[PDB]
Motif scaffolding. Sequence first.
Motif, PDB file in Angstrom:
ATOM      1  N   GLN A 163       0.824  -1.150  -0.054  1.00  0.00           N
ATOM      2  CA  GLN A 163       0.079  -0.019  -0.049  1.00  0.00           C
ATOM      3  C   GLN A 163       0.998   1.329  -0.003  1.00  0.00           C
ATOM      4  N   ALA A 164       0.809   2.057  -0.876  1.00  0.00           N
ATOM      5  CA  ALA A 164       1.661   3.109  -1.097  1.00  0.00           C
ATOM      6  C   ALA A 164       1.112   4.285  -0.078  1.00  0.00           C
ATOM      7  N   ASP A 165      -0.056   4.055   0.196  1.00  0.00           N
ATOM      8  CA  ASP A 165      -0.747   5.196   1.283  1.00  0.00           C
ATOM      9  C   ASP A 165      -0.650   4.491   2.633  1.00  0.00           C
ATOM     10  N   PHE A 166      -0.320   3.394   2.936  1.00  0.00           N
ATOM     11  CA  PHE A 166      -0.377   2.950   4.306  1.00  0.00           C
ATOM     12  C   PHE A 166       0.627   3.603   5.078  1.00  0.00           C
ATOM     13  N   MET A 167       0.384   4.071   6.384  1.00  0.00           N
ATOM     14  CA  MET A 167       1.049   4.980   7.340  1.00  0.00           C
ATOM     15  C   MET A 167       1.022   4.059   8.563  1.00  0.00           C
ATOM     16  N   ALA A 168       2.403   3.924   9.027  1.00  0.00           N
ATOM     17  CA  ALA A 168       2.708   3.524  10.495  1.00  0.00           C
ATOM     18  C   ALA A 168       3.508   4.445  11.165  1.00  0.00           C
ATOM     19  N   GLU A 214       9.098   3.345   9.745  1.00  0.00           N
ATOM     20  CA  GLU A 214       9.274   3.421   8.296  1.00  0.00           C
ATOM     21  C   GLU A 214       8.528   2.527   7.537  1.00  0.00           C
ATOM     22  N   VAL A 215       7.898   2.844   6.481  1.00  0.00           N
ATOM     23  CA  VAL A 215       7.370   2.039   5.655  1.00  0.00           C
ATOM     24  C   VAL A 215       7.905   1.940   4.186  1.00  0.00           C
ATOM     25  N   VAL A 216       8.327   0.948   3.896  1.00  0.00           N
ATOM     26  CA  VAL A 216       9.001   0.597   2.484  1.00  0.00           C
ATOM     27  C   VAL A 216       8.204  -0.453   1.865  1.00  0.00           C
ATOM     28  N   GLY A 217       8.304  -0.546   0.470  1.00  0.00           N
ATOM     29  CA  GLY A 217       7.471  -1.455  -0.358  1.00  0.00           C
ATOM     30  C   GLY A 217       8.305  -2.637  -0.788  1.00  0.00           C
TER      31      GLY A 217
END
Length: 159
Positions: free
Chosen positions: A68-73, A77-80
């Motif tokens: 998910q490009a929009d998922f926030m944590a 750090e959010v990486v694909g």
Amino acid sequence: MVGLIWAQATSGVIGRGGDIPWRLPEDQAHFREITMGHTIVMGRRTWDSLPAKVRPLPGRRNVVLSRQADFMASGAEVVGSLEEALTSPETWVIGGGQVYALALPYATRCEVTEVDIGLPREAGDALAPVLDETWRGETGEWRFSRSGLRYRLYSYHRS
Ligand SMILES: NC(=O)C1=CN([C@@H]2O[C@H](COP(=O)(O)OP(=O)(O)OC[C@H]3O[C@@H](n4cnc5c(N)ncnc54)[C@H](OP(=O)(O)O)[C@@H]3O)[C@@H](O)[C@H]2O)C=CC1
Ligand SMILES: Cc1ccc2[nH]cc(CCCOc3c(C(=O)O)cnn3-c3ccccc3)c2c1
Ligand SMILES: [Co+2]
């Protein structure tokens, strides 16, 4: 260095319904000891599994893998991609079943806690990764958790 750390029943189950069907307080302390100060890489479902009071896990770079490009944590750090997350001297993959398998090629250490719970495998469960011929294990004593289940440490190393 990339390591994997997980707790499993003897059958191999590590999760069910988005959580873990046991809690050994001695395993929680061992996880903090082995992970403290380093990067922890977890999938989105395991981050969701962290209570909002405890996340991000303190003293550590929380990295959450997602498509998910929009998922926030918040606080993480959010990486694909998994190797977008492997830029520190020592990395620990803290789950779950999907990311353990995705990170296994990058891994030279598996710190595995075997929980003597008789738990049959069932559909939708998360399972521990299969370790192939290349992995050498050193085994510890069966110890008693205060939660009433036996457990023991398996340390797997490979070059
Ligand atoms: N027994 C133990 O020690 C542990 C148990 N667990 C348990 O495991 C279970 C969760 O495991 P699981 O269901 O497998 O989910 P995961 O924790 O492994 O997260 C999977 C998610 O990460 C993203 N993902 C997967 N592959 C990729 C990829 N190549 N690239 C980018 N993103 C990817 C996706 O998120 P998205 O859909 O948003 O795109 C996917 O849905 C829970 O029950 C948990 O409590 C968790 C940690 C350890
Ligand atoms: C995600 C994951 C993957 C594999 C694992 N193997 C062993 C554990 C125990 C994890 C404890 O994680 C922590 C901390 C800490 O690490 O600092 C602070 N609070 N909690 C905490 C978290 C959820 C509920 C209650 C307390 C584990 C965890
Ligand atoms: Co350390």
